[PDB]
Amino acid sequence: QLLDLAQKHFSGLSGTYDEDAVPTLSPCRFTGSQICHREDGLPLAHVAIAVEGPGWAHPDNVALQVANAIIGHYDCTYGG
Amino acid sequence: GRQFGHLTRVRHVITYSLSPFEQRAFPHYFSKGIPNVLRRTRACILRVAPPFVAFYLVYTWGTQEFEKSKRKNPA
């Protein structure tokens, strides 16, 4: 049903395509750095701290996620 | 004694910093450095030097006058 509809409504993006402008993503350099927006008029401070992760495809995203689960998450409304 | 978080009120100031492992310790050591030392020598030679140059003259004359005082040409 779905494949029929895709030929029914999405066909008409061929004829001739790409060729002249092939746009592949270049890698993005991670920098160990700090951004500090001091604002004492805001009631509570927000901090986000991160190292460079490996990316979508890497098999060891599973193992990192397990450790991230061990640390987990908290919230003042949690019963625990 | 005061600690961080109790010092003062500061608002709307962003500080961008780099890791010491991403940046060089001596960026332009001689190229930026040499002009800078000359600049702050120039900024202060008129306040630091004129008392020392004055001491040097009071020292050079004083030592000279001490030697040529005991000796005498007539009896």
Swiss-Prot record, chain A:
Domain of life: Eukaryota
N6-acetyllysine PTM sites in chain numbering: 8
Subcellular location: Mitochondrion inner membrane
Purpose of the protein: Component of the ubiquinol-cytochrome c oxidoreductase, a multisubunit transmembrane complex that is part of the mitochondrial electron transport chain which drives oxidative phosphorylation.
Family affiliation: Belongs to the peptidase M16 family. UQCRC1/QCR1 subfamily.
Subunit relationships: Component of the ubiquinol-cytochrome c oxidoreductase (cytochrome b-c1 complex, complex III, CIII), a multisubunit enzyme composed of 11 subunits. The complex is composed of 3 respiratory subunits cytochrome b, cytochrome c1 and Rieske protein UQCRFS1, 2 core protein subunits UQCRC1/QCR1 and UQCRC2/QCR2, and 6 low-molecular weight protein subunits UQCRH/QCR6, UQCRB/QCR7, UQCRQ/QCR8, UQCR10/QCR9, UQCR11/QCR10 and subunit 9, the cleavage product of Rieske protein UQCRFS1.
The protein's name: Cytochrome b-c1 complex subunit 1, mitochondrial
Organism of derivation: Bos taurus (Bovine)
Record gene name: UQCRC1
Part of the whole protein covered: 241 to 320 of 480
UniProtKB/Swiss-Prot annotation, chain B:
Residue ranges annotated as Mitochondrial matrix topological domain: 1-38
GO cellular component terms attached to this protein's record: mitochondrial inner membrane; respiratory chain complex III
Record's keyword terms, sorted: Acetylation, Electron transport, Membrane, Mitochondrion, Mitochondrion inner membrane, Respiratory chain, Transmembrane, Transmembrane helix, Transport
Keyword Manganese among record annotations: no
Modified residues (N6-succinyllysine): 32
Function (record text): Component of the ubiquinol-cytochrome c oxidoreductase, a multisubunit transmembrane complex that is part of the mitochondrial electron transport chain which drives oxidative phosphorylation.
The protein's name in its UniProt record: Cytochrome b-c1 complex subunit 8
